[PDB]
Coordinates of C-alpha atoms and ligand atoms in Angstrom, one line a residue:
Chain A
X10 CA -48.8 -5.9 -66.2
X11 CA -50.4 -2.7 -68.1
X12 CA -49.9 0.6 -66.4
X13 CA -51.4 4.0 -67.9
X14 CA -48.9 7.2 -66.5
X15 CA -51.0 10.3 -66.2
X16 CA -48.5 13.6 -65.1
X17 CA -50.8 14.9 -62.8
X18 CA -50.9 18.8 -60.8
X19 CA -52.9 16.8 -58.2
X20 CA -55.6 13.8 -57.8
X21 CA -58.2 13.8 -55.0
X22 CA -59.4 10.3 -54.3
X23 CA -63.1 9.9 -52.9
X24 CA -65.4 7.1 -51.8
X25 CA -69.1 6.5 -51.1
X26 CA -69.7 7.5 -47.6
X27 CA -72.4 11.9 -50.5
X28 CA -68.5 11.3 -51.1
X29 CA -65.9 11.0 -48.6
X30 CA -62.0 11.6 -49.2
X31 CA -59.8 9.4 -48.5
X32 CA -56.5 10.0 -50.7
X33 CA -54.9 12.8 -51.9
X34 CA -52.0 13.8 -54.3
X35 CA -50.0 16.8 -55.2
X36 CA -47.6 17.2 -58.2
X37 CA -46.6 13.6 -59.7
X38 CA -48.3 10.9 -61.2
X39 CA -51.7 8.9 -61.0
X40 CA -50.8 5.2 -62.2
X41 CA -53.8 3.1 -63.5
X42 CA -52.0 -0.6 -62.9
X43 CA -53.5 -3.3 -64.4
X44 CA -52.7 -7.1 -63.0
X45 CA -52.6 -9.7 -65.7
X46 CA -53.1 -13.2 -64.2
X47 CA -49.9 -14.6 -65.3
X48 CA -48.0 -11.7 -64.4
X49 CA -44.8 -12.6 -62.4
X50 CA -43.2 -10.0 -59.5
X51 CA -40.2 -9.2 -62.8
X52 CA -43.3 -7.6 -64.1
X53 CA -44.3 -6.0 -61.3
X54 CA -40.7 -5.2 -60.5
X55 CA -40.2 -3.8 -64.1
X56 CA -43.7 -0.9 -64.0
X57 CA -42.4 -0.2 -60.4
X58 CA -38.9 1.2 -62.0
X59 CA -40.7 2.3 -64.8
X60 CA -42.9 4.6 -62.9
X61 CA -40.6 5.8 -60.1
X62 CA -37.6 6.6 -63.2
X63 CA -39.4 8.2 -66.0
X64 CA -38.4 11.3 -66.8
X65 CA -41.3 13.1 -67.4
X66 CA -41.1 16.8 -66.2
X67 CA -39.0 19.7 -68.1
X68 CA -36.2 20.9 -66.1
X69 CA -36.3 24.8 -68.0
X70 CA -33.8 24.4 -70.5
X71 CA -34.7 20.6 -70.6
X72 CA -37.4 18.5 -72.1
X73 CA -38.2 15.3 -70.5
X74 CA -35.5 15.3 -67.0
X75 CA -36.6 15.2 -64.3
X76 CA -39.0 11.7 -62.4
X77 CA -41.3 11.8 -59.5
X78 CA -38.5 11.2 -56.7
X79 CA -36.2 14.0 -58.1
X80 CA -38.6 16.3 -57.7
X81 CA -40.4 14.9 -54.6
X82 CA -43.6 14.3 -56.1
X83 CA -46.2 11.8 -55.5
X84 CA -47.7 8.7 -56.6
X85 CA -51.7 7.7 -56.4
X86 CA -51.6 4.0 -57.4
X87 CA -55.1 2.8 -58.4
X88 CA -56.0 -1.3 -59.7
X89 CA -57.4 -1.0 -63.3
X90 CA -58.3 -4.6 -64.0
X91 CA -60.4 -2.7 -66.9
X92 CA -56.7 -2.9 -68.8
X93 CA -57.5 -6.4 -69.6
X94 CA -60.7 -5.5 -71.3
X95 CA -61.7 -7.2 -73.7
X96 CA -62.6 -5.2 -76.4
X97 CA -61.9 -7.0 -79.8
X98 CA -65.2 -9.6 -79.9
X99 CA -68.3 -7.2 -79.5
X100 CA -69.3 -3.6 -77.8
X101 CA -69.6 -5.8 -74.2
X102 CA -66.1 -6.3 -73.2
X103 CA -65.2 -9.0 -70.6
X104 CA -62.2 -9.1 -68.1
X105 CA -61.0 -12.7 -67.8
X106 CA -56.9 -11.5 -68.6
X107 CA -57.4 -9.8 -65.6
X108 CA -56.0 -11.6 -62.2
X109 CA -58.3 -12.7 -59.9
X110 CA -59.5 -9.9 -57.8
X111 CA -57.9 -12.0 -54.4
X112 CA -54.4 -12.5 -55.7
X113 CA -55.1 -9.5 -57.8
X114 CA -55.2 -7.7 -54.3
X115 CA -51.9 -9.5 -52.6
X116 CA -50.3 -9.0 -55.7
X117 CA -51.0 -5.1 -55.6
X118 CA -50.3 -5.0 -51.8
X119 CA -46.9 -6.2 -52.5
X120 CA -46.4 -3.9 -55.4
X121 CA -47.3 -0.7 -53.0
X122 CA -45.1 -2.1 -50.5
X123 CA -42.1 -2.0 -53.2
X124 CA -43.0 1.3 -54.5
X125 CA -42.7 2.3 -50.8
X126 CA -39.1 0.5 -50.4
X127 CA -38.0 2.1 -53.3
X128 CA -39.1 5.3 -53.1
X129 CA -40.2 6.9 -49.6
X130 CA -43.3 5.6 -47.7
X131 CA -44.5 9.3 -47.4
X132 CA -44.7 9.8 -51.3
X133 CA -47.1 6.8 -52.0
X134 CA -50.9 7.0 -51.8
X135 CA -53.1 4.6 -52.4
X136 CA -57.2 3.9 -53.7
X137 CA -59.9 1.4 -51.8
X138 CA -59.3 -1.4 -54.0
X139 CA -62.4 -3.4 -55.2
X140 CA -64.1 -0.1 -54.4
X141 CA -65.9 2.1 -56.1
X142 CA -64.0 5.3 -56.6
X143 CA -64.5 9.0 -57.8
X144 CA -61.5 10.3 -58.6
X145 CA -60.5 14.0 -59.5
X146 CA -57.1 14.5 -61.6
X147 CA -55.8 17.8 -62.0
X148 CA -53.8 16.3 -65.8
X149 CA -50.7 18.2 -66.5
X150 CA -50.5 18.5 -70.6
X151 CA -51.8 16.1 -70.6
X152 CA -49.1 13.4 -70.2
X153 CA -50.1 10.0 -70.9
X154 CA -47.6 6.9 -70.9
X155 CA -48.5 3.6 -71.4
X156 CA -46.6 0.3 -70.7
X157 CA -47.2 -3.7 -71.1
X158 CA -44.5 -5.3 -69.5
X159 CA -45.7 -8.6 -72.0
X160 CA -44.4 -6.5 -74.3
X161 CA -41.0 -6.9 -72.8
Chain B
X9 CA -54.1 3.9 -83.5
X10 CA -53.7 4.4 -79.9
X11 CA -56.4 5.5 -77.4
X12 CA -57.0 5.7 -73.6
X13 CA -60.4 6.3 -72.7
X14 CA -61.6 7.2 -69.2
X15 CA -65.2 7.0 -68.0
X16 CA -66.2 10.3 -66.4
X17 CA -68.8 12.6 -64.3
X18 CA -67.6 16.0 -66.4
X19 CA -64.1 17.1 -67.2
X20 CA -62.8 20.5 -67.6
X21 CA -60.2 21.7 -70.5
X22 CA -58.1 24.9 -69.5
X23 CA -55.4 26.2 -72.1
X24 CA -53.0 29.5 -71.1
X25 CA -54.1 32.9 -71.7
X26 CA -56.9 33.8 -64.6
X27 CA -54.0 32.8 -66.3
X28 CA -55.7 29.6 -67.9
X29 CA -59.1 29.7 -69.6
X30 CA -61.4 27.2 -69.9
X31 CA -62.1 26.5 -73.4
X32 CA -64.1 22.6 -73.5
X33 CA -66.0 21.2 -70.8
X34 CA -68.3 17.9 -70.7
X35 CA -70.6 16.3 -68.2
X36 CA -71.0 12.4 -68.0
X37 CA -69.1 10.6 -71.0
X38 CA -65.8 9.8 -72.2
X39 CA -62.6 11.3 -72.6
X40 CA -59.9 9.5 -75.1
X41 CA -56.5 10.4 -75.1
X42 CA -55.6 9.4 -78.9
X43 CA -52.4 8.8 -80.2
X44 CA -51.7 8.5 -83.6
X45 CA -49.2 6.1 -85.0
X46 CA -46.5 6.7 -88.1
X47 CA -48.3 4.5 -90.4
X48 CA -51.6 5.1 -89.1
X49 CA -54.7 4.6 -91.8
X50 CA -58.5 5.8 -91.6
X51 CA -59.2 2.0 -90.8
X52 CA -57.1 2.6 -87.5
X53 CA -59.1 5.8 -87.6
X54 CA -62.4 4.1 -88.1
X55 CA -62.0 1.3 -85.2
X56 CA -61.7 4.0 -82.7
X57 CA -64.2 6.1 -83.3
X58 CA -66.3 2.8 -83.1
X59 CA -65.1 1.4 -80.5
X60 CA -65.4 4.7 -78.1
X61 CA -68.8 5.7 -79.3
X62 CA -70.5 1.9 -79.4
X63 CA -68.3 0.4 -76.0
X64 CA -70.5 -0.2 -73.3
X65 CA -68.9 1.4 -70.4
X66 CA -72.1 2.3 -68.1
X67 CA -74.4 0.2 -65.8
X68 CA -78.1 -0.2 -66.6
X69 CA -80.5 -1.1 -63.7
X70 CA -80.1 -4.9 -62.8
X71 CA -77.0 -5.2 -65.8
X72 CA -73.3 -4.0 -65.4
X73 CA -71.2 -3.4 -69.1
X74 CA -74.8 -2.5 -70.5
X75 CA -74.8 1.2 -72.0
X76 CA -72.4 3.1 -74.3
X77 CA -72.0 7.0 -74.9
X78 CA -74.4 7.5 -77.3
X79 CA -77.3 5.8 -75.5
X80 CA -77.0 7.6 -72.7
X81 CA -76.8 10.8 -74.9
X82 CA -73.3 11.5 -72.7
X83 CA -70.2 13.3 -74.7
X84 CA -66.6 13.0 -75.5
X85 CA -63.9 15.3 -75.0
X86 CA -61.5 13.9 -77.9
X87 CA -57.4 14.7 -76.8
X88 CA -54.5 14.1 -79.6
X89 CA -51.8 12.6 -77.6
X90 CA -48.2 11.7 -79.0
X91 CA -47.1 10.6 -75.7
X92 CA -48.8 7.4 -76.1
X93 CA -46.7 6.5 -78.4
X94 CA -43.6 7.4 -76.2
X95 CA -40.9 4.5 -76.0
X96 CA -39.9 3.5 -72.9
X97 CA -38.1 0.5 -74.1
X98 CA -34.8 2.0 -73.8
X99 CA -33.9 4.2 -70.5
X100 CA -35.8 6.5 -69.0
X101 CA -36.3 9.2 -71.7
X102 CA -39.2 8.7 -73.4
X103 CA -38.7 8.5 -77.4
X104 CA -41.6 9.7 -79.4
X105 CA -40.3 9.1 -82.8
X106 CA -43.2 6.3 -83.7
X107 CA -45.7 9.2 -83.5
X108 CA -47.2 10.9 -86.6
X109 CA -45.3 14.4 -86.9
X110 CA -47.4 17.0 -85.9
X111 CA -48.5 18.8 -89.0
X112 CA -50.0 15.0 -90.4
X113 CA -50.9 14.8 -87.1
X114 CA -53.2 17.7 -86.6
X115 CA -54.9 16.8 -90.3
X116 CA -55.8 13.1 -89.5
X117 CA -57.2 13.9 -85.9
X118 CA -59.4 16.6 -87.4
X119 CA -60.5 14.2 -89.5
X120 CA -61.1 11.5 -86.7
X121 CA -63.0 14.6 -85.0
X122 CA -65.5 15.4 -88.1
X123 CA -66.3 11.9 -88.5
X124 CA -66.7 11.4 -84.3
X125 CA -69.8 14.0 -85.3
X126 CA -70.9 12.3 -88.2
X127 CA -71.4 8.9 -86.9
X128 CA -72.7 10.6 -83.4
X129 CA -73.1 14.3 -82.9
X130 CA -71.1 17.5 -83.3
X131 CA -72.5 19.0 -79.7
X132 CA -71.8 16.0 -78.1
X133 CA -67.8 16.2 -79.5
X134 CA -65.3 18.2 -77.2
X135 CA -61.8 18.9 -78.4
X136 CA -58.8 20.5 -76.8
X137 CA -56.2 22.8 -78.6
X138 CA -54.1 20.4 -80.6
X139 CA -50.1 21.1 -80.2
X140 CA -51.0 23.2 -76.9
X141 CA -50.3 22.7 -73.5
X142 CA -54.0 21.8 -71.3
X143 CA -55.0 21.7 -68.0
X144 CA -57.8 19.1 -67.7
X145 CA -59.7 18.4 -65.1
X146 CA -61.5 15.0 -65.0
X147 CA -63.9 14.0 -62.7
X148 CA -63.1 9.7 -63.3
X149 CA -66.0 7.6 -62.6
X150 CA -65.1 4.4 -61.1
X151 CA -62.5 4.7 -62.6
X152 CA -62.8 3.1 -65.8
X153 CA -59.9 2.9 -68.0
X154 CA -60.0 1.6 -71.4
X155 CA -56.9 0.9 -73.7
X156 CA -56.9 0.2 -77.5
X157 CA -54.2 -0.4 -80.0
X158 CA -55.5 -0.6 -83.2
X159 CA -52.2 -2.7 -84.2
X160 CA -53.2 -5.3 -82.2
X161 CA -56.4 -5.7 -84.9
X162 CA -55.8 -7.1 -88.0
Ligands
ADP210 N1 -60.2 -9.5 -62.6 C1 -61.4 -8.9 -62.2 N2 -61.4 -8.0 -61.1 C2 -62.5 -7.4 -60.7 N3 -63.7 -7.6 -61.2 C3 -63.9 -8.4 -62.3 C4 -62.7 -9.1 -62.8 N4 -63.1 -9.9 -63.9 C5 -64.4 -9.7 -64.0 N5 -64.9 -8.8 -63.1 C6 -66.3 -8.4 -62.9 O1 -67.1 -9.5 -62.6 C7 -68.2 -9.6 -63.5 C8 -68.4 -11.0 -64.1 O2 -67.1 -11.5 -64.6 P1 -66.8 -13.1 -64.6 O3 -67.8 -13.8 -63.7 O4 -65.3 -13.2 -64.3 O5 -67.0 -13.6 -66.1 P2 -68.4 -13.5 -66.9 O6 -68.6 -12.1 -67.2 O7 -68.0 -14.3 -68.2 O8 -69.4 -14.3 -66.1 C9 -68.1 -8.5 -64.5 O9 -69.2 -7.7 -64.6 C10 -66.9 -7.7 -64.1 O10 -67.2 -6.3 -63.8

């Protein structure tokens, strides 16, 4: 699984209705999650920790301290399944690493259901997955954090 | 080399000193978030710059994965950003230590930024406040999220 952390002041999630809102965020973090198609539920298990304990807010007098459930913040998970792009043969990449958007789907389900368990079902927004999505991200920094749990 | 790149509508880049002020902005385009490795060399450089100005990120009529930035005569709002290279490996502190210290740093993405303008254009190349904190603003379209590590090439 790849998952790209942005440290967000707030994200406003929209969809084609001209745009319609459906999701919004606060302080905490907007994860891109990307589904591999031999990813296990260790590797979703492992971005889940990742992104619920990383200490990635100052805490004055500290650098680095504080995660979103300290401080109460908020998640917007979003499927990326442009992760697995291919961009190493030509300028046209392709997406075949990428899970197959139906067990991509019950994969993610379970992972927001876990994220939920873990955290607090309050704290845990979600996109329209498959569907096109405008997306408005207040970054904080910016703080960007990337992780491939294949790299683990 | 590191980069994120996100496909946008505009984004907005805010720095302190009403008490932020807006000093970038672009429309449609791209904005990379680029880290820069240690041992990073103007090949790493080069395969970025390439890669974000010639990757085919936008639909064209009838065919999906079709156009790229300079096609469309869209922008790039170019960010350095060290925290790509934050471990996470061990605990839950990141450690940045695999990232080019900042004065090296700042010289090799100013390079990366003159030579984004050469092989495009220098009013279609937005930049941030290297070392500062921002406030950006993106407007993601899609969303659309690339990721390249130039280590993985050869
Ligand atoms: N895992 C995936 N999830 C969602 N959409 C995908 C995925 N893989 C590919 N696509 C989309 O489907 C289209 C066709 O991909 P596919 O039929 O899998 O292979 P190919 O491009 O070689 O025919 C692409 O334009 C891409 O946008």
């Amino acid at each position: 699984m790849r998952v790209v952390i942005q440290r967000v002041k707030g994200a406003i999630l929209s969809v084609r209705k001209e745009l319609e809102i459906i999701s919004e965020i606060k302080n905490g973090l907007i994860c891109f999650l990307g589904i591999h198609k031999n990813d296990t539920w260790e590797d979703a298990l492992y971005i889940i920790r990742k992104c619920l304990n990383l200490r990635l807010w100052n805490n004055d007098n500290k650098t680095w301290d504080k995660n979103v459930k300290d401080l109460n913040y908020e998640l917007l998970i979003v499927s990326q399944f442009t992760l697995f792009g291919n961009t190493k043969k030509g300028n046209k990449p392709d997406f075949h690493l990428a899970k197959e958007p139906n067990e991509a789907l019950i994969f993610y389900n379970k992972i927001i259901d876990e994220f939920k368990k873990q955290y607090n079902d309050d704290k845990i927004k979600i996109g329209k997955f498959g569907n096109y999505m405008n997306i408005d991200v207040t970054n904080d920094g910016p703080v960007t954090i990337y992780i491939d749990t294949h790299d683990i």
